[PDB]
Structure 1
Amino acid sequence: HMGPNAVELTTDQAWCLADVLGAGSYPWVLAITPPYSDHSQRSAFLAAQSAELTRMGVVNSAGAVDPRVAQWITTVCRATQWLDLRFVSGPGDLLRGMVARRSEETVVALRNAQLVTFTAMDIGHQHALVPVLTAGLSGRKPARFDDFALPAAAGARADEQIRNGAPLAEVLEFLGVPPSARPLVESVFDGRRTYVEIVAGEHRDGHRVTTEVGVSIIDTPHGRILVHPTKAFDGEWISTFTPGSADAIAMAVERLTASLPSGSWF
């Protein structure tokens, strides 16, 4: 449709719109929750919010939601396939995102603190998801190194130990990292680092199905680093660290959705 491709609004306006559409609850990843428990406060909240939206042209004077907005919102709330995005930006603040797909339509939702954006997007365009998947990171170029691997569990134990403030050299000994690899491997644990956790999910046949292990993208002073899972035969998960390029990200996420019963979106 000729026009703006997005709706931008506060979490409260979003919630009021979902409530009025009967769209259902937002996905947990977006973390949009009802402001009040009480019924009168709620009804007032809704009238107010709706007024402001009417003023914003999102809803017409009669009270009917713009059909594109309604479709984007419904696609997010009722989504049959999706990606969940948690961007941990430094300490204390995070960007929350979703790529939702219902009936051939694909909607991106991003939310930060007070604001949420819903925008339609065409996945037909090559690498079209890569700027979304990196939206909340530092803009770092892909690092230069040969691939390495760690047992996923060990990696997690290491991160836990480093947040508890234990010496790096002993943790890198614990992982079995040779002194030669240490400056690189450290960066994955580096104190100033931005990362995003990506998970794929779908629902079919009475089941919500998501990937038990996800994919990570990590901006470090040494560069952009992609981590992706492979299940070993002994039952242990392996994390593989590779440069964070767009090909690498695209492929990794595609494989991620492919591990689900309904497969890729291609």
Structure 2
Amino acid sequence: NAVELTVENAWFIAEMVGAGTFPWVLAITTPYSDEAQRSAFFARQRDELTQLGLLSSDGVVNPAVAEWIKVVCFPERWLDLRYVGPDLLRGIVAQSFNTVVALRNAQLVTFTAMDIDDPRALVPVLGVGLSARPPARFEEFSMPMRVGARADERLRSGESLDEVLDYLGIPVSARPVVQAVFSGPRSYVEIVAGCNRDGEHTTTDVGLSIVDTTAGRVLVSPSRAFDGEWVSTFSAGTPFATAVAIDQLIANLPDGQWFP
């Protein structure tokens, strides 16, 4: 039970509710580019929103939704979402008790209210934009990241993939699965945790990522090292090993993880 709308619809609600500016991951900008065109849309939007019912007679907005926007514009602890699949879908997971999630498929913002039930209740919403593959199995290994980011920089500058995935601490059982992610039918997402308990707000230096390729779902959980560097494990896409792989990322923030 929720509701969807467009980017121009969404922004108008921020003007009557007073939430302000949306998170820029949603890319919800202002529709019109001159106050001379303001009345045209101040009158066309209130006209379209009463057709959906969420906007009452004159200017009153639906309370079940006016709550969903305030918690999104100014949250306390959020989780940026950026799905990629051949077309990009992106949203945010806000919390303020209640938790409201939003998604924008390049034209349609869709809000939805969730709960803080358990660490396992978040694996659907982070695996709904993917292709919903079953978790694969392979030999887990952890390679340095700042060197692993140099690998992808070669592939994109014209480099072969089979002669570089061996120049790592690569096993033999995991070369078939890492070869399927550099293909057409594959999708991934980048998760960035954020908190706003200061005069400013902060996000994480790195982020969690899951990939639904042909071989199956793949978890990619980073972890801090002793020298301040980042190393990431490539494990199976367990819907329960991800719930712990994320509170790790949230621990990097001065507000600590959300719940044990």
Contact 1:15 1:34 in 2 (8 A): yes
Structure 2: runs of 5 or more not aligned: none
2:74 to 69, 73, 78: 78
Instruction: Give TM-score scaled by structure 1 length.
Output: 0.91
- 1:131 paired with 2:124, answer yes
Secondary structure at the residue paired with 2:116?
A: coil
- 1:63 paired with 2:63, answer no
CA distance in 2, matches of 1:156, 1:227: 13
1:187 match: 180
- 1:265 paired with 2:258, answer yes
CA distance in 1, matches of 2:230, 2:85: 26
Instruction: Give TM-score scaled by structure 2 length.
Output: 0.93
Contact 1:199 1:210 in 2 (8 A): yes
CA distance in 2, matches of 1:82, 1:88: 20
1:239 to 232, 237, 257: 232
The Cα shift of 1:28 comes to 0.9
CA distance in 2, matches of 1:255, 1:110: 24
CA distance in 2, matches of 1:138, 1:47: 40
Q: How does 1:69-148 map to 2 (within 5 A)?
A: 69-90=65-86, 93-102=87-96, 104-125=97-118, 127-148=120-141
Q: How does 1:140-219 map to 2 (within 5 A)?
A: 140-175=133-168, 177=170, 181-219=174-212
RMSD: 1.7
The Cα shift of 1:180 comes to 5.9
The Cα shift of 1:176 comes to 5.0
AA aligned opposite 1:18: A
User: Residues 191, 236 of structure 1: CA spacing in aligned structure 2 closer, same or farther, 3 A cutoff?
Assistant: farther
Deviates more, 1:5-14 or 1:172-181: 172-181
**Which consecutive segments of 4 or more residues in structure 1 shift more than 4 A?**
178-181
Structure 1: runs of 5 or more not aligned: none
CA distance in 1, matches of 2:190, 2:230: 16
2:32 match: 36
Deviates more, 1:42-51 or 1:128-137: 42-51
CA distance in 2, matches of 1:243, 1:47: 52
2:246 match: 253
Secondary structure at the residue paired with 2:196?
A: strand
Deviates more, 1:219-228 or 1:165-174: 165-174
The Cα shift of 1:39 comes to 0.8
Deviates more, 1:172-181 or 1:130-139: 172-181
AA aligned opposite 2:228: G
Secondary structure at the residue paired with 2:38?
A: helix
